[PDB]
Design a binder for these strands. Structure first.
Lengths: 437, 437
RNA sequence: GCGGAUUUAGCUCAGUUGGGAGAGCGCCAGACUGAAGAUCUGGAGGUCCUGUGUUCGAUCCACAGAAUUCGCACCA
RNA sequence: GCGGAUUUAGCUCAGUUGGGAGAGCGCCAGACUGAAGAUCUGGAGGUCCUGUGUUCGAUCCACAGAAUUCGCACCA
């Protein structure tokens, strides 16, 4: 669609200027006031300070640099003293060393105690690194901020922007590092088409090489992978979207695509036509952070997946959804019903000892030999994958993560077909089964 | 049941003396007459000559030794000339070098041209070896003939006596060699409990050792495995029956056990309770020898077995029966119905070339990535193992042996449940599923 | 008939994740030697038995066939 | 919290068919030496991280746990 046109029309949905821009300055000014009132060494960092934040994603990050001659707890008292007096409403978030989150004029503000540490390698944790992150990008990104926003937008539209585990996609800082390295969104897109699972981007030397994993080198600390949270699968998605974009560019790569919103009638048909067993594990949501839940949900999903493999219902895919109330573990298998009878692996014919024991056990059918080894017909306790998972969930809850497993242990349901379609899992089911529009 | 008593009561069902013993002598005498009438060098061998044949299993083996200074075809003319004149009704069976099979007074007689070859290593085929076989066992078996008959009886009662492929069990000559080696049936049974898949019995040296396969050394030619036809599985069966006999001896080890003879009503229930898919491939019997058909049937069964494994209906066992009219390939699977959808293995994400092609193909559902590799949902052409086999039989008949495959190629049926129970396959189905009485 | 095993470099053979065609020996060269050899380096060297099919992709999966090899035995 | 990787002989590590507990090094010995070393032979050497469970059978499969290790990050 001409390429450059859609790049510019995308900006009116990317660039903030819903006149929150000034609300930033207003809060900043106000923030700058009260802060200079207490004579503290302070820095504005993150999205706001570089004028790089997305439309609606307004956030002030304030990092309070504290003398390189104090102690952990002496900065503690301070961050509090300050945060409180400068913010309008507050909470305390402790991380690895605590910080104050609050609100100034409807703008989410992050008041954070730091160190006036000037120059790296003398770093203790991830927090003290962001000032340097800002420092290095400051002045080296000036002018190219729009191109960053395009990248972000591109990634958000297809749901791979973010460092949080719910996404495992691209971190903002990474995006910035990228735009810097290539020159613009596009020159990034072009080269991304040639990325591999072993492609390494050292921004510090301006060099591209092959390593062991996909690695983007932090120009501040060359021991740091900025793209550490980028999952294997997401990276590939990005690469493929870059190949798909260049060949036939369109604006639909920048619009966030919306729910397919189906009726139970069309979904049941798909299932029927698929001839697959579709079911889910429902259980109440344990009240914990997002960056804890999804990892557990994933682990939980995987084990059940692995289970149904062992018991040979042959699952296709697995999916998960977390509402404000419950959690759902979705599964589609190739086997609706398995036989009650199965092969039980018995001893080689020579080990008379073990033979007898194996034979001493009482069964409904005679054991036999095949390839110089005994085998026996025995009975399963479950015939459908629903029945099997029920057995598994009830007996092997503990392995399904700490909080998730406990929530299942205490209670769970298994929902099949028409009943399940009524649950808020429509979107993911379609995504799991790969339904067209 | 006392042990020795049942050994003696078994003999009245083992020792011939249904007064066919004299019919032997009568025919022998008559045979000896006409033969000496033509001045031929002749020998009586096999079961009859040693008085070792089973009750009802009466057969005269006559091997016509011919001068060690003739040629293949010059003996040929002779065997005929002789066979005809001495037998009452005849056929010609060609083997590797032909022979005359016929009847003298209702007794199946085998008139065979040989060589007066005295002493081995100058042998050409299996036929010229039997005189030496008889020669070596003659006089070294005298007195111990009853003990041989016990062994035979033991093996026949449980259906592992015979060198023909329908059985793949113990050859008579082998049994004799055994009784000779240990001393009696029992001393054979005791030691057989300690046989392995690598136990070697050299009768010539009177020695037991370990080799590579189960090997019984022919005292005549030490390059010959007498137990070559003994299948792995049958050997084990024998060994296990020897262990089972010594621990609790009973006469039921000598009675041939009879059909379980079931109704369709009890069989359907078992199937239902088993929850398994049971079906068979029916097709007309190609008119060929037994030692050709069963090998093919086996091969045929196996491939179908292997197929259902590939397509994951997960078969349990496989069985075959050959009537005077049709042949049956019986199968029991763990999967009655499989989903219409399956995983299609696609390329790794890097090989852009192959990616596109894989994606160019049209499907009902979107392809995806998992572990850096593309996968696609596609449709099977069959949902039940019956449907699948139908597809397989029709497309892959040729591999199912020469004659068998051709018979299926031209025609076949697949029969399920109630319909199949009406077919003469009741016994084997019970044997395949391991049903109790 | 019949069945199993085998078929990848000149020789002898590995090769299982369906994506890299390999080792040893032989041959050529380099290093080393006074020489040659022995050792270390390296290089060249291919109809993965043939055909067709399955697959995005084939030494590998399927079918047909070929060749080598061992045995099976019918006979009964 | 949160996740992954790892845990087999004194050290460093193989170990995939669920049935044999292994290699290299180290140590002792034999052979060889004038000696010792170097090489070849061999031997000893084990809580397969623990527990419980599955199985005829447990390094291998399942659950709980431990320890080592790397990273995840929430924060928003």
């Amino acid at each position: 669609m001409k390429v450059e046109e859609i790049l510019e029309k995308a900006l009116e949905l990317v660039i903030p200027d819903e006149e929150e821009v000034r609300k930033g300055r207003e809060a900043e000014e106000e923030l700058r006031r009260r802060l200079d009132e207490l004579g503290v060494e302070y820095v504005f960092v993150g999205s706001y300070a570089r004028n790089t934040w997305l439309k609606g994603s307004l956030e002030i990050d304030v990092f309070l640099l504290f003398p390189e001659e104090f102690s952990k707890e002496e900065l503690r008292e301070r961050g509090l003293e300050i945060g409180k007096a400068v913010l309008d409403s507050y909470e305390i978030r402790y991380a690895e060393h605590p910080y104050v989150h609050g609100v100034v004029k409807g703008v989410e503000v992050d008041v954070v105690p730091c160190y006036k540490l000037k120059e790296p390698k003398n770093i203790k944790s991830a927090v003290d690194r962001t000032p340097f992150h800002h420092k290095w990008l400051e002045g080296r990104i000036k002018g190219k901020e729009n191109e960053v926003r395009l990248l972000k937008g591109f990634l958000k539209a297809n749901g791979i922007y973010g460092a949080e585990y719910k996404v495992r996609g691209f971190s903002g800082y990474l995006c910035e590092l990228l735009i810097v390295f290539y020159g613009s969104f596009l020159e990034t897109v072009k080269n991304a088409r040639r990325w591999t699972r072993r492609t390494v981007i050292d921004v510090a030397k301006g060099e591209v090489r092959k390593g062991e994993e996909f690695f983007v080198v932090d120009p501040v600390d060359e021991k740091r992978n900025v793209a550490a949270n980028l999952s294997l699968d997401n990276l590939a998605r990005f690469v493929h979207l870059c190949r798909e974009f260049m060949e036939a560019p369109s604006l639909g790569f920048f619009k966030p695509k919306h729910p397919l919103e189906i009726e139970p009638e069309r979904l049941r048909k798909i299932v029927e036509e698929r001839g697959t067993a579709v079911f889910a594990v429902k259980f109440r949501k344990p009240d914990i952070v997002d960056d804890n839940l999804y990892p557990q949900l994933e682990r939980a999903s995987r084990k059940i997946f692995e289970f149904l493999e062992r018991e040979n219902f042959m699952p296709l895919r697995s999916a998960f959804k977390a509402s404000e109330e419950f959690c759902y573990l979705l599964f589609e298998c190739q086997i609706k019903e398995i036989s009650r009878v199965f092969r039980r692996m018995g001893p080689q014919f020579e080990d008379e000892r073990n033979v007898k024991k194996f034979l001493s056990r009482n069964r409904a059918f005679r054991p036999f030999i095949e390839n110089g080894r005994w085998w026996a017909f025995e009975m399963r306790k479950f015939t459908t994958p629903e029945e099997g998972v029920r057995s598994y969930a009830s007996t092997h809850w503990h392995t399904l993560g700490k909080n998730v497993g406990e929530s299942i242990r205490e209670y769970f349901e298994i929902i099949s077909g028409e009943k399940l379609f009524k649950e808020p899992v429509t979107a993911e089911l379609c995504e799991m089964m790969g339904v067209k529009d």
